[PDB]
């Protein structure tokens, strides 16, 4: 179990850790989150009481270092930082526990939700989408735009998701125009899986990361990227059986976890109706189809 201490909490803010969250009052003696499960990525995120715009947060993995949160009154936001003095860090953590000023990561033992949402997400790939290589953790927020969005302005602050575009030379072999556009198997399996992602697990990891970013920060380009990667699979006639079954589980836990009130902006009607009912893989997503119908029949 690991800890992320907070220096203080000077401004009223809703703090989230993975799928959980807490209201913290201005200058409430709050000083960290303890018992954070080792072995997965995690995200700590924020929304100030005064600005219900700009949700922001930090992706991290406690194996990669000792991290803590400090409010910066110049930039006006909670910043993640790394303590290199391992002793100085265990000192701070132990005293805050002794004084019991930390909340416990509230994981129910039956619950595999966070595992299921992050199964293929690896800190090393996150740092290639959010390039900021002096930190071991990754900042994301509501307003950050993607590389694909930028092409159609500041690259230091871009989400460098893999660009997918169904009407591009990449996607379409000369001479197989109609074939490749109606059956994206080539694009998925040769270009994207064998070529760029190397394996299904990296592909799933980016897909999962894009979803979490859309869910936790309402990041719109991330929502676009999650749908594109679903659509590329569902629009391929030839997909490894292990990918289809795993995709059904991935999407199930994402749909399960989404806030009911947000289905309108986070779920693209066209993509889902095409994937569940019209695509080659209509019949390969039984669990995802069953939960979508029972929870969002309106969108369909």
């Amino acid at each position: 179990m690991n800890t992320v201490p907070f220096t203080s909490a000077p401004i009223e803010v809703t703090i989230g850790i993975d799928q959980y969250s807490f209201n913290v009052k201005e200058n409430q003696p709050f000083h960290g989150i303890k018992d954070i499960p080792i072995g997965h990525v995690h995200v700590i995120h924020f929304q100030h009481a005064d600005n219900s715009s700009m949700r922001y947060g930090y992706w991290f993995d406690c194996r990669m270092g000792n991290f803590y949160i400090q409010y910066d009154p110049k930039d006006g936001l909670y910043k993640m930082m790394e303590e290199r003095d391992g002793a100085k860090f265990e000192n701070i953590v132990h005293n805050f526990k002794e004084r019991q000023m930390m909340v416990s990561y509230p994981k129910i033992d039956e619950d595999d939700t966070w595992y299921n949402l992050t199964e293929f997400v690896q800190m090393d790939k996150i740092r290639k989408i959010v390039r900021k290589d002096e930190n071991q953790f990754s900042y994301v927020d509501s307003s950050m735009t993607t590389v694909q969005e930028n092409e159609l302005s500041d690259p230091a602050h871009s989400l460098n998701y893999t660009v997918i575009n169904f009407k591009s030379r990449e996607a379409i072999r000369p001479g197989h125009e109609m074939e490749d556009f109606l059956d994206k198997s080539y694009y998925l399996n040769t270009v994207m899986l064998q070529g760029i992602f190397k394996n299904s697990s990296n592909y799933f990891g980016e897909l999962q990361f894009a979803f979490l970013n859309a869910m936790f920060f309402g990041n719109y380009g991330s929502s676009l990227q999650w749908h594109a990667m679903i659509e590329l699979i569902c629009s391929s006639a030839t997909v490894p059986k292990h990918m289809l079954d795993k995709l059904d589980e991935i999407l199930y836990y994402q749909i399960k976890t989404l806030p009911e009130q947000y289905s309108d902006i986070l779920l693209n009607e066209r993509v889902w109706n095409i994937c569940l009912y019209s695509s080659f893989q209509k019949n390969s997503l039984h669990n995802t189809e069953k939960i979508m119908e029972n929870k969002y029949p309106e969108l369909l």
Binding site: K167, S168, R169, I172, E177, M178, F181
Partner: protein
């Protein structure tokens, strides 16, 4: 974006543009089989690719052999259209390639766009206009060359004959679409009007009769009258 009544005069500026109409690419007759089931028999069709400014028509004849052994032919016809239009652009010298292609049916956008990926500066546009180019096979010389074809074949025509020697593109296009609108709404009447007077002939190198200016006015009025009458009939107005 889309082409409509507002931005109609753009057709006659000096940016090269082509209309593509695929309505007559895949043509069938429907008939009963011995066992009483219904079956189709394809006949030859054509892509109608027209430069509205100059009258140049690139009539790409689609021979029934293209369909042999193929499934989902109505869908395939859109991609074959896009394949052929793309090949036509590639065959033209650079300074003759269009800056825009306007497709008359929105279902053609994705196929053309995919086939034109090599030409990112050629804009593929839909239109909201209800253009009557499906009636192109009501022009006798065009229907004749299509039905006689024994192989794939491109035939070039000026669809305006020599009108531009005396009128502007705008007017020429308005006359063409009026003629075709009429042929589309009542082909028998329309053709009666055009040929009633046996002393007005069609030049060997033309599609339409050699009307004088005054006679074109009478013709255009007769086509307008025809079109309005058929409207009252369709709707009981």
């Amino acid at each position: 974006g889309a082409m409509n009544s507002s931005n109609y005069a753009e057709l006659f500026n000096n940016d090269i543009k082509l209309f593509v109409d695929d309505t007559n690419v895949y043509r069938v007759t429907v008939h009963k089989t011995f066992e009483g089931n219904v079956a189709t028999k394809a006949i030859n069709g054509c892509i109608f690719t027209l430069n509205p400014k100059t009258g140049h028509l690139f009539l790409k004849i689609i021979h029934t052999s293209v369909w042999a052994g193929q499934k989902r032919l109505s869908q395939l016809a859109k991609w074959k259209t896009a394949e052929e239009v793309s090949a036509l652009v590639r065959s033209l010298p650079k300074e003759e390639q269009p800056k825009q292609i306007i497709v008359t049916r929105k279902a053609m956008l994705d196929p053309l766009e995919v086939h034109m990926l090599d030409f990112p500066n050629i804009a593929i546009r839909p239109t909201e206009l209800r253009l009557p180019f499906s009636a192109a096979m009501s022009i006798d010389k065009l229907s004749d060359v299509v039905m006689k074809a024994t192989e794939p074949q491109m035939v070039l025509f000026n669809i305006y004959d020599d009108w531009l020697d005396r009128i502007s593109s705008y007017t020429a296009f308005s006359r063409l679409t009026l003629l075709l609108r009429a042929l589309k709404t009542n082909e028998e009447s329309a053709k009666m009007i055009l040929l009633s007077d046996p002393t007005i002939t069609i030049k060997s190198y033309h599609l339409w009769p050699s009307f004088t200016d005054e006679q074109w006015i009478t013709i255009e009025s007769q086509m307008r009258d025809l079109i309005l009458t058929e409207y009252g009939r369709k709707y009981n107005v």
